[PDB]
Design a protein around this ligand. Structure first.
Ligand SMILES: Nc1nc2c(ncn2[C@@H]2O[C@H](COP(=O)(O)OP(=O)(O)O)[C@@H](O)[C@H]2O)c(=O)[nH]1
Ligand SMILES: [Mg+2]
Ligand SMILES: [Zn+2]
Lengths: 206, 34
């Protein structure tokens, strides 16, 4: 049915099963309390509002119901997506090896939409996929962020980058963080500093 | 910057997709507009 104007975008959140997609989208409390279940597609659409210096913007994030564990997602999942997050798990190299497949599936249906690559679970000390190895985004005009869904680490960063690209305003800012579920684990500050340094080095090194 | 309210379809009540008025059916989830 027709819902009863606001800037909003369909954002598809893809990546291997077990990488943390559901845990990540659920950090945004109002997006979880106002989520919509889409029975025909097996999707939960989370409406995530972010308050920018030019007003509110909603990312309607399409979270699977696990079907990615058994094959590709159907066209209706992807259709009219305006942006995307591809997620992998930095403790599982195979999930990073599959990133090009998700990207191919995305571009096949959606062409050149803005995409952010996110390496999740950086709170876990025994990290397997390190900054020096994370190169897929450089090849494809993708932005990369380390994230930890369970600790809210860098939660806002993919959305801010996407918002700037979609609106075409490099100076857009979030005036406040969204209300997020309290961290379930600690993101070690020293670990975060190391990982931010490692990314800085990879980006500036000759 | 300029507020989106000045700067700025029907919305599916099932999946929130914004659809064009020519469509009486949500192109993503197939929910009728009516
Ligand atoms: N330590 C840690 N575990 C996470 C994080 N995100 C998800 N997990 C766990 O990884 C498992 C899969 O998470 P889930 O959100 O269901 O992934 P999905 O299949 O990609 O939706 C679950 O046991 C999560 O608790 C994270 O940031 N850090
Ligand atoms: Mg999931
Ligand atoms: Zn719909």
């Amino acid at each position: 049915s027709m819902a009863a104007p606001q800037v909003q975008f369909k954002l598809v959140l893809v990546g291997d099963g077990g990488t943390g997609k559901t845990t990540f989208v659920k950090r945004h409390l109002t997006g979880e309390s106002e989520k919509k279940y889409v029975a025909t597609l097996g999707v939960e659409v989370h409406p995530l509002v972010f308050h920018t210096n030019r007003g509110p913007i909603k990312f309607n994030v399409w979270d699977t119901a696990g079907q990615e564990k058994f094959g590709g997602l159907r066209d209706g999942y992807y259709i009219q997506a305006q942006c995307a997050i591809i997620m992998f798990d930095v403790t599982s190299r195979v999930t990073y090896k599959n990133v090009p497949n998700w990207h191919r599936d995305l571009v096949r249906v959606c062409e050149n939409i803005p995409i952010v690559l996110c390496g999740n679970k950086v709170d876990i000390k025994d990290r397997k996929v390190k900054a020096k190895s994370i190169v897929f985004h450089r090849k494809k005009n993708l932005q990369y962020y380390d994230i930890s869904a369970k600790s809210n680490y860098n939660f806002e960063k993919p959305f801010l980058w996407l918002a700037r690209k979609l609106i075409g305003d490099p100076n857009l800012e979030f005036v406040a963080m969204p209300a997020l579920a309290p961290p379930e684990v600690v993101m070690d500050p020293a670990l975060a500093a190391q990982y931010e340094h490692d990314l800085e080095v990879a980006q500036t090194t000759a | 910057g300029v507020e989106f309210g000045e700067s700025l379809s029907w919305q599916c009540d099932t999946c929130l997709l914004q659809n064009k008025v020519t469509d009486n059916k949500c192109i993503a989830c197939q929910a009728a507009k009516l």
